[PDB]
């Protein structure tokens, strides 16, 4: 198991423009196209992201490319955010992967907004952190692909992906 295989499990590999479990226009392996309600935007965002005229469909090679870019962006997002970086760096290796996953799904701003969760994770209060993370829109709308991430913060093992 690793962060890539973890996110492939949580996000799947879709080659067609779909609305994800949070209701957003999406493609590949959990690549968020736009927070706009417009479908045109999704398509013009996809062409922008790929560098060719798609038409709302991509290759597995292209999905894997966006996916690497997106994992790379989640890690850089954490490291450049003053609230997340020290909490992240306090974490053991497996919890760090749950952290990357959470940001990949929800984005930096959303994740950094869980002030209490951050403090608890930093102090290694794993149960409290997990309890507080489950009190999110994310948890209610993508329950199976949120429960595994939260359980991972609780246990510090890969068992939920086994
Ligand atoms: Ca690291
Ligand atoms: Cl470790
Ligand atoms: Cl789900």
Swiss-Prot record:
Pfam families per the record?
Answer: Phage_lysozyme
Q: Which residues does UniProt mark as catalytic?
A: 11 (proton donor/acceptor), 20 (proton donor/acceptor)
What does the annotation give as the result of altering residue 11 to A/F/H/M/N?
Answer: Complete loss of enzymatic activity
Q: Which domain of life is it from?
A: Viruses
Inducers of expression: Expressed late in the viral replication.
The entry's localization annotation reads: Host cytoplasm
Annotated consequence of substituting residue 11 to Q: Complete loss of activity
User: Which keywords, in A-to-Z order, does the entry hold?
Assistant: Antimicrobial, Bacteriolytic enzyme, Cytolysis, Glycosidase, Host cell lysis by virus, Host cytoplasm, Hydrolase, Viral release from host cell
Q: How does activity depend on pH?
A: Optimum pH is 7.3.
Kindly give the InterPro entries that the UniProt entry links to this protein. Endolysin_T4_type, Glyco_hydro_24, Lysozyme-like_dom_sf, Lysozyme_dom_sf, Phage_lysozyme-like, T4-type_lysozyme
Enzyme class per UniProt: hydrolase
Catalytic activity annotation: Hydrolysis of (1->4)-beta-linkages between N-acetylmuramic acid and N-acetyl-D-glucosamine residues in a peptidoglycan and between N-acetyl-D-glucosamine residues in chitodextrins
Record-linked SUPFAM superfamilies: Lysozyme-like (SSF53955)
Coiled-coil positions are: none
- Principal localization reads host cell
Q: Name one GO cellular component term.
A: host cell cytoplasm
Name the residues that bind substrate: 32, 104, 117, 132
For biological process, the GO terms are: cell wall macromolecule catabolic process; defense response to bacterium; peptidoglycan catabolic process; viral release from host cell by cytolysis
Effect of mutating residue 26 to E: Complete loss of activity at neutral pH; covalently bound substrate
The answer on whether this UniProt entry bears the keyword Hydrolase reads yes
Q: Write out the GO MF terms.
A: lysozyme activity
E.C. numbers: 3.2.1.17
Question: Does the record's keyword annotation contain Ubl conjugation?
Answer: no
The UniProt entry's sequence similarity note says:
Belongs to the glycosyl hydrolase 24 family.
Function, as annotated? Endolysin with lysozyme activity that degrades host peptidoglycans and participates with the holin and spanin proteins in the sequential events which lead to the programmed host cell lysis releasing the mature viral particles. Once the holin has permeabilized the host cell membrane, the endolysin can reach the periplasm and break down the peptidoglycan layer.
The protein's name:
Endolysin
